[PDB]
Amino acid sequence: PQLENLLCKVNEAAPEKPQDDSGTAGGISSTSASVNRYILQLAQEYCGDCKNSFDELSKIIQKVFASRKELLEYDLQQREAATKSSRTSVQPTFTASQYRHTSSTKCYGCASAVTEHCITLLRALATNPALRHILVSQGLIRELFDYNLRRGAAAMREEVRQLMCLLTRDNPEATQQMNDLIIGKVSTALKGHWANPDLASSLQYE
Amino acid sequence: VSQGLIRELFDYNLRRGAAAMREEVRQLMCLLTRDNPEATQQMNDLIIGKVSTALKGHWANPDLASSLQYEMLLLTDSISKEDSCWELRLRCALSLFLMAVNIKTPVVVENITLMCLRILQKLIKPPAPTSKKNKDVPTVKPYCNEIHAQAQLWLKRDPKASYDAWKKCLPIRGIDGNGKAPSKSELRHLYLTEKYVWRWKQFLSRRGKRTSPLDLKLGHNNWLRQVLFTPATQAARQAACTIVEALATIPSRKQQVLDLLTSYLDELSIAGECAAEYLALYQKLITSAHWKVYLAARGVLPYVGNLITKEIARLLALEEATLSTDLQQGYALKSLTGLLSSFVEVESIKRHFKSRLVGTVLNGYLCLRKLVVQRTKLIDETQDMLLEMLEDMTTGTESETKAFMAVCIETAKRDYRTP
Amino acid sequence: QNSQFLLTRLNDPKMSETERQSMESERADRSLFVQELLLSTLVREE
Amino acid sequence: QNSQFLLTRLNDPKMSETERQSMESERADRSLFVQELLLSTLVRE
Amino acid sequence: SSGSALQYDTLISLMEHLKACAEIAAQRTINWQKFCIKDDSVLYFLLQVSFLVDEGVSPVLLQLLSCALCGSKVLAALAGSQEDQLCTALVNQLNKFADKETLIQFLRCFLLESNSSSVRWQAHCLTLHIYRNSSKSQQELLLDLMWSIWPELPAYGRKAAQFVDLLGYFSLKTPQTEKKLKEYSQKAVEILRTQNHILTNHPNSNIYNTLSGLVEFDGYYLESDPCLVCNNPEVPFCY
Amino acid sequence: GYFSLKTPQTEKKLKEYSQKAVEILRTQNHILTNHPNSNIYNTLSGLVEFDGYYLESDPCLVCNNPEVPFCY
Amino acid sequence: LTEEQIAEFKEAFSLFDKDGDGTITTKELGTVMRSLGQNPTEAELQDMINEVDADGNGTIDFPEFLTMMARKMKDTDSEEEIREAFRVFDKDGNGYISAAELRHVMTNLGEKLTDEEVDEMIREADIDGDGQVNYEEFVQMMTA
Ligand SMILES: [Ca+2]
Ligand SMILES: [Ca+2]
Ligand SMILES: [Zn+2]
């Protein structure tokens, strides 16, 4: 909730004049002191406190997983020993039965990693002209424009832009669609530039 | 306002300057629209258009935070004031709320749906009275079986549905009186006159010469549940819980919202720990054994028993997977078992449902005892509660007991340890 | 303190007892109207 | 170094001399077209 | 017949012998290749064993498989004609023995579930040479198996990187019919749409987007049931 | 402001005063919107809390030069 | 009445069967009716609670509750009491209900309607147009 709240304040982007608090125990340089207090508060709350708590939780989760694995192995050995006069030739399920290294569902992180893998695979496929036309017919350009253009690491964003450029190579219908999308977005952002200065965030990318 | 100050302030001065200057600009706009249909209507329409275009872009723009943000703080400041134009402001609020709830995107929820829910909550739950010796929130009393207001028509600016017309429709509360007067005959008389006056209006409406009232009936899959499980923010869930608790003022509306919630019960199992606020609301609404018995009559006990059985079966089918540890593993199970224990804590329901709950409690406890690797503290508490409930159900007449023993036989029929 | 600025001092709270009762009744009626509005919003479209 | 990943290594530059001349002529003609386009944009209505 | 896990000393003796074989194969590759062309059961059984070992023994078994399968001309290049003929004979023998189930199994086990990038790269090289030295039918079959594993990718996260590489390469290297080309494209775009919808509707997607905008950070510290992939790193050994 | 709302005044001059106020507001709003480094100041106010506008041509003697405080 | 229904009835009756101070049993039974699937108006509830005062705490038996519901059941129609209605609606000892006593009934209920609304109501009820309503026309409306 604290991060939820500090983020709200930071989004307001208020120019609260520098507050020179009497307490100077922390070594805050003029530039850092002039940084938005909420920004610094967010950085301390998430990178400091949330990261420390998450590291502690991950260590505890790994130790719990190791304990569960040892207990399960002991139970497997005991039931196998108690299953005398009965032998099942397991194959190749030995893996499925005991090893049981997998990403939990709804994991923003590894979900974004899978998205990056999808971008890499699509950049590979788009090279083949027939595959490129098929992907354009699927509707890949609009998906990449709406979702993958603005999210991910900057290298991933540039890879998405290259993928779209590849999809629109020597393809009048494809290039036309991307151009129409860009024109629409740019004209909408020109219909409120004075009203709302969020034009720089998207129009720049387009 | 005639100069065009509202549009200038909206376009330019709402977002630039120090935060104190922004709040002063918002107050200035609220003043300009105070008791001024023209001005208030214009500002409300501007807010509507802006929020609507940002909802048409939410999927392509993740910066919704900064945009709808300042315009919705303006709505909330405008509706916080009390002018004679509250109607149009409430209309804008409801419209934006519905549009954003139709959206599950957190950015959209946490901004639009959250401020809209807060506006609706501050309207439904007015500030505590200052005079009238701080009287309870309960001049017009609603019809027991009907909703005399309309939402689809009111949002469409129809003069047929409005605060004036609606308030005209319902009778004045007036004074019941008859403090020392039994008025036994007068009671039957008023019964007859009320019944056939409502019949007169109902027939006049089916002929089509009068506006059609609405029937107190819900679909069981409405925005209620949409805001109820939002994992996006706890503030939206708390606001929805407050709204539903305040909708529960009237006993018939209490019945209807209780049916809605006991239908949403499945979404508790689906959402896990996100449904804590809904659980608190539901237990608060049924704190009286009166409504516990009502829900038991409707068949809530088999529903919760089946939900507990399904959750325990999911855990059993889940221990065949990795040792993946989940912090909120068993919150739904523990909460469903707590609900069942709360219902059983009423004697009559226990009497009538011991023979029907013994089987499901036995099956659940036996299946929970099988858990070794996935056994969580919450699972242990659930198993202890099931044991206590079973012991509480073992107690009974030899007949009921022998019947419970017959159940035990079927449970064993359904492994050298568990039996 | 802040009393030097005439414009800021302008805001004058004033609210009377019978008008207190009337305003509180208005708040209660508006709350009831919004309750009916949301309940009619939830009504199944059948 | 970066040669482990086959997909990244895929990009193959290849450009021939007569096709160099043709492409350079195409660039020059496109530049001239854009010059005429902007000059016609500046023309007085 | 017995499940659970193998004794540590059994793994020790296994590793002694397999290190001896790895030493033989590395310094002298043709010897190993011809021994396994005399004994195909050796080649298939080494993979099948690499199933039922710990991740400690897996590098050596994969090294043996790569030395037999991809010789050591390429192995050193990564770090005469009769030799490559033996390599092709060995991969053909493996494809004759290895059914699609075991192929699927080790391909997900080492390319996807390895958790050790070094083993994942060994499996990448091994599968790449398997596909290269295979004929058209086995090439199509391998490509189909990996496209069958493709929908299960979201469960492995970053680990999948090497896997995806091969997939993409193979998908553009094998001459393939229009029908299966469309099927592969549909699978890829479907996974992309699913992940995009997941990220868009994720409960704390707004928080992560805003923090990525403002504050520098490496991991997503506020995550329920932390992914055993994103969170668990390949802890490196150190002096 | 006080005087404008304290003196009983004719509708004509009330409209004139309102027009003057809104005209000054429109002029300042257009100046701020089209200001050469308006984007820079807006973004910096968003990110870094800054007391004054350090990048200003011909710093108005009124802004940059404030009353110096007498001290011991 | 099919057993299926008398059964639901006993069922709920029982589930709510509880005792206490005042007349809980009456309240418990009003909640039974609403639980059964029939929601009476607050007025109907008060009337039935009074229409049962045999013993302390409004003692109600299952047969007694069956008798209570058998009177109105689904409250679909009650000519004997539409008649009772005309007797109450038509006041001033007249043979035809008038707008005056109609608005009197409305105020006794607590509803305030403008004479214009009262005129609309009486124009709707009257069929021949004599300016009055016999049981005939009362029925007309209540049945339509
Ligand atoms: Ca009369
Ligand atoms: Ca007549
Ligand atoms: Zn993960």
SS (H, E, C) chain B: CCCCHHHHHHHHHCCCCCHHHHHHHHHHHHHHHCCCHHHHHHHHHHHHHHHHHHHHHCCCCCCHHHHHHHHHHHHHHHHHCCCCCHHHHHHHHHHHHHHHHCCCCHHHHHHHHHHHHHHHHHHHCCCCCCCHHHCCCCCECCCCCEECCCCHHHHCCCCCCCHHHHHHHCCECCCCCCCCCCCHHHHHHHHHHHHHHHHHHHHHHHHCCCCCCEECCECCCCHHHHHHHCCCCHHHHHHHHHHHHHHCCCHHHHHHHHHHHHHHHHHHHHHHHHHHHHHHHHHHHCCCHHHHHHHHHHCHHHHHHHHHHHHHHHHHHHCCCCCCCCCCCCHHHHHHHHHHHHHHCCHHHHHHHHHHHHHHHHHHHHHHHCCCCCCCHHHHHHHHHHHHHHHHHHCCCHHHHHHHHHHHHHHHHCCCCCC
Handedness of CA B372, B374, B377, B382 (dihedral sign): negative
Q: What does the alpha-carbon distance between residue A75 and residue A78 come to, in Å, rounded to a whole number?
A: 5
Find all residues with CB under 8 Å of B37, minimum gap 6, and list them.
B85, B88
Which tokens belong to B399? 């007949």
Distance G131 CA to ligand 2 centre (A): 6
**What's the gap between Cα A160 and its chain centre?**
14
DSSP per-residue letters across C6-46:
HHHHT------HHHHHHHHHHHHHHHHHHHHHHHHHHB---
The burial of E20, by beta-carbon neighbours within 10 Å (0-12 exposed, 13-18 middle, 19 or more buried), is given as: exposed
Cβ contacts of B200 on chain G, cutoff 8 Å: 121, 125, 141-142
Amino acid identity for residue G124 in this structure: E
Which tokens belong to G132? 């009055």
Of B90, B127, B222, the CB nearest to C34: B90
Helix residue ranges per DSSP H, E79-116: 81-97, 100-111
Question: Do F22 and B16 make contact, defined as CB atoms within 8 angstroms?
Answer: no
Which tokens belong to B181? 């007067």
**In a 3-state reduction of DSSP, which class is residue G17?**
coil
E220 neighbors A143 (Cβ within 8 angstroms) = no
Closest of B294, B401, B395, B390 to residue B349, by C-alpha = B294
Q: What does the alpha-carbon distance between residue B378 and residue G13 come to, in Å, rounded to a whole number?
A: 37
Which CATH code, of 1.10.3720.10, 1.10.238.10, 3.40.50.880, 1.20.1740.10, is assigned to G2-75? 1.10.238.10
B73 neighbors A18 (Cβ within 8 angstroms) = no
CATH top-level class of G76-142: mainly alpha
Distance B207 CA to ligand 2 centre (A): 19
Phi, psi of G97 (to 5 degrees): -65, 145
Query: For G134, which DSSP code?
Result: -
Secondary structure (H, E, C), E112-161: CCCCCHHHHHHHHHHHHHHHHHCCHHHHHHHHHHHHHHHHHHHHCHHHHH
Is G92 labeled as ligand-binding?
yes
Find all residues with CB under 8 Å of B118, minimum gap 6, and list them.
B76, B235, B239
Q: What does the alpha-carbon distance between residue E71 and residue C34 come to, in Å, rounded to a whole number?
A: 79
Q: CB-hemisphere CA count at 13 Å for B396?
A: 21
Amino acid identity for residue B108 in this structure: V
B96 neighbors B47 (Cβ within 8 angstroms) = yes
Q: What does the alpha-carbon distance between residue G58 and residue G76 come to, in Å, rounded to a whole number?
A: 26
Query: For E39, which DSSP code?
Result: -
Q: How many B×E Cβ pairs under 8 Å?
A: 32
Distance A108 CA to ligand 3 centre (A): 7
Of B139, B163, B215, the CB nearest to C25: B139
F49 neighbors A34 (Cβ within 8 angstroms) = yes
With CA atoms as reference, the chain D residue closest to A128 would be D10
Which tokens belong to B156? 């469409």
E110 neighbors E125 (Cβ within 8 angstroms) = no
Q: How many CB atoms lie within 10 A of CB F65?
A: 9
G in contact with C (at least 3 C-beta pairs within 8 A): no
Question: Kind and range of the H or E element at G71?
Answer: helix G62-72
The burial of A190, by beta-carbon neighbours within 10 Å (0-12 exposed, 13-18 middle, 19 or more buried), is given as: exposed
The burial of B8, by beta-carbon neighbours within 10 Å (0-12 exposed, 13-18 middle, 19 or more buried), is given as: middle
Of A14, A36, A194, the CB nearest to F48: A36
B29 neighbors B9 (Cβ within 8 angstroms) = yes
Q: What does the alpha-carbon distance between residue G107 and residue B171 come to, in Å, rounded to a whole number?
A: 9
CA distances from A90 to A87, A94, B318, E3, E52 (A): 9, 6, 21, 8, 11
Of E203, E209, E210, the CB nearest to B231: E203
Cβ contacts of C7 on chain F, cutoff 8 Å: 1-2
Q: What does the alpha-carbon distance between residue C34 and residue B149 come to, in Å, rounded to a whole number?
A: 9
Q: At what angle do helices B377-394 and B331-344 cross, to 10 degrees?
A: 20
E22 neighbors E63 (Cβ within 8 angstroms) = yes
CA distance C16 to chain B (A): 10
E166 neighbors E127 (Cβ within 8 angstroms) = yes
Which tokens belong to A16? 């609260």
Which tokens belong to A161? 């832009």
DSSP per-residue letters across F11-57:
HHHHHHHHHHHHHHHHHHHHHHHT-TTHHHHHHHHHHB--SS--S-S
Closest of B52, B93, B71, B94 to residue B9, by C-alpha = B71
A172 neighbors E230 (Cβ within 8 angstroms) = no
Long-range Cβ contacts of E133-137 (<8 Å, 24+ apart) = E133/E69, E133/E70, E133/E87, E133/E88, E133/E91, E133/E92, E134/E91, E134/E92, E134/E95, E135/E92, E136/E174
Q: What does the alpha-carbon distance between residue E134 and residue E125 come to, in Å, rounded to a whole number?
A: 14
Q: What does the alpha-carbon distance between residue A116 and residue A138 come to, in Å, rounded to a whole number?
A: 19
Cβ contacts of F33 on chain B, cutoff 8 Å: 12
Find all residues with CB under 8 Å of B408, minimum gap 6, and list them.
B362
Q: What does the alpha-carbon distance between residue B96 and residue E93 come to, in Å, rounded to a whole number?
A: 67
**In a 3-state reduction of DSSP, which class is residue E55?**
coil
Q: How many CB atoms lie within 10 A of CB G97?
A: 26
Find all residues with CB under 8 Å of A32, minimum gap 6, and list them.
A40
Q: How many CB atoms lie within 10 A of CB F9?
A: 13
Mutate: best of F11, F25, F38, partner B, most B CBs <10 A: F25
Phi, psi of B97 (to 5 degrees): -55, -55
Question: Do B12 and F32 make contact, defined as CB atoms within 8 angstroms?
Answer: yes
Q: What does the alpha-carbon distance between residue B252 and residue E13 come to, in Å, rounded to a whole number?
A: 77
Which tokens belong to A189? 């952002």
Phi, psi of F20 (to 5 degrees): -60, -45
Handedness of CA B362, B367, B370, B373 (dihedral sign): negative
Closest of B188, B192, B150, B143 to residue B170, by C-alpha = B143
Adjacent-strand bridge partners of E14: none
Adjacent-strand bridge partners of B214: B147
Q: How many C×F Cβ pairs under 8 Å?
A: 5
Torsion, CA G106, CA G108, CA G114, CA G117, rounded to 10: 0
Q: What does the alpha-carbon distance between residue A97 and residue E1 come to, in Å, rounded to a whole number?
A: 12
Q: What does the alpha-carbon distance between residue F45 and residue A34 come to, in Å, rounded to a whole number?
A: 11
Question: Kind and range of the H or E element at E24?
Answer: helix E8-27
Distance B246 CA to ligand 3 centre (A): 41
Q: Whose structure tokens read 């017995």?
A: E2
Question: Do A11 and E210 make contact, defined as CB atoms within 8 angstroms?
Answer: yes
**Experimental structure resolution, Å:** 3.2
Ramachandran sector of residue C19 (left: φ over 0; alpha: ψ -120 to 50; beta: rest)? alpha
**In a 3-state reduction of DSSP, which class is residue G97?**
strand
How far the first Cα of chain E sits from its last, in Å, is 40
Q: What does the alpha-carbon distance between residue B62 and residue A58 come to, in Å, rounded to a whole number?
A: 29
Q: How many CB atoms lie within 10 A of CB C31?
A: 19
Cβ contacts of B209 on chain G, cutoff 8 Å: 120, 124
Question: Do C21 and B131 make contact, defined as CB atoms within 8 angstroms?
Answer: yes
Closest of B203, B228, B202, B224 to residue B215, by C-alpha = B202
Query: For F65, which DSSP code?
Result: S
Amino acid identity for residue B208 in this structure: G
Find all residues with CB under 8 Å of C11, minimum gap 6, and list them.
none
Q: What does the alpha-carbon distance between residue A49 and residue A181 come to, in Å, rounded to a whole number?
A: 42
Adjacent-strand bridge partners of B266: none
Q: Whose structure tokens read 């509250």?
A: B86
Phi, psi of B218 (to 5 degrees): -120, 155
- Breaks, C-N > 2.5 A, in chain C lie after none
Question: Do D6 and E169 make contact, defined as CB atoms within 8 angstroms?
Answer: yes
The number of residues in chain D equals 45
F13 neighbors F4 (Cβ within 8 angstroms) = no
Q: What does the alpha-carbon distance between residue B400 and residue E120 come to, in Å, rounded to a whole number?
A: 64
Which tokens belong to B267? 């979404």
Closest of E161, E159, E162 to residue E128, by C-alpha = E162
Question: Do B132 and C34 make contact, defined as CB atoms within 8 angstroms?
Answer: no
- Interface residue B417 vs chain F (CB under 8 A): no
Ligand minimally distant from the alpha carbon of residue G133: 2
**In a 3-state reduction of DSSP, which class is residue E23?**
helix
Q: What does the alpha-carbon distance between residue G133 and residue G139 come to, in Å, rounded to a whole number?
A: 9
Q: What does the alpha-carbon distance between residue B173 and residue G111 come to, in Å, rounded to a whole number?
A: 9
B14 neighbors B74 (Cβ within 8 angstroms) = yes
Q: Whose structure tokens read 């009074």?
A: G50
Handedness of CA B249, B251, B257, B262 (dihedral sign): positive
Q: What does the alpha-carbon distance between residue G78 and residue G139 come to, in Å, rounded to a whole number?
A: 10
**What's the gap between Cα E35 and its chain centre?**
25
Which tokens belong to G62? 């299952």
Numbers of helices and strands, H then E, in chain D: 2, 0
- Interface residue B4 vs chain F (CB under 8 A): yes
Handedness of CA B32, B34, B37, B43 (dihedral sign): positive
If you compute the radius of gyration of chain G from its CA atoms, what whole number of angstroms results? 19
Q: CB-hemisphere CA count at 13 Å for A156?
A: 17
Q: What does the alpha-carbon distance between residue B366 and residue B371 come to, in Å, rounded to a whole number?
A: 9
E52 neighbors E65 (Cβ within 8 angstroms) = no
Which tokens belong to E33? 């290749």
Spell B239-263 as b/e; 16+ CB within 10 A means b: bbbbbbbbbbbbbbbbbbbbbbbbb
How far the first Cα of chain F sits from its last, in Å, is 38
Which tokens belong to G39? 């929601």
With CA atoms as reference, the chain B residue closest to A69 would be B323
Angle at the Cα of E119 (from E117 to E120), degrees rounded to 5?
Answer: 60
Cβ contacts of E205 on chain B, cutoff 8 Å: 62, 105-107
Specify the domain boundaries for CATH 1.10.238.10 within chain G. Answer: 2-75, 76-142
B146-147 and B214-215: which strand pairing?
A: antiparallel
Spell B195-227 as b/e; 16+ CB within 10 A means b: bbbbbbbbbbeeeeebbebbebebeeebbbbbb
DSSP per-residue letters across chain A:
-HHHHHHHHHHH---PPP---S---S---HHHHHB-HHHHHHHIIIIIIIHHHHHHHHHHHHHHHHHHHHHHHHHHHHHHHHTTT------STHIIIII---PPSS-HHHHHHHHHHHHHHHHHHTTSHHHHHHHHHHTHHHHIIIIITTSS-HHHHHHHHHHHHHHTTT-HHHHHHHHHHHHHHHHHHTTSTTT-TTHHHHHTT-
Cβ contacts of F25 on chain B, cutoff 8 Å: 5, 8, 13
Touching chains, C (3+ CB pairs < 8 A) = B, F
Find all residues with CB under 8 Å of G99, minimum gap 6, and list them.
G115, G118, G119, G121, G122
Question: Kind and range of the H or E element at E184?
Answer: helix E178-200
Of B5, B8, B16, the CB nearest to F32: B16
Mutate: best of C5, C6, C9, partner F, most F CBs <10 A: C6
Is G143 labeled as ligand-binding?
no
Q: At what angle do helices B398-413 and B347-369 cross, to 10 degrees?
A: 30
Ramachandran sector of residue B272 (left: φ over 0; alpha: ψ -120 to 50; beta: rest)? left
Adjacent-strand bridge partners of B215: B146
Angle at the Cα of B339 (from B338 to B342), degrees rounded to 5?
Answer: 85
DSSP per-residue letters across A89-113:
---STHIIIII---PPSS-HHHHHH
CA distance E230 to chain B (A): 14
With CA atoms as reference, the chain D residue closest to E128 would be D6
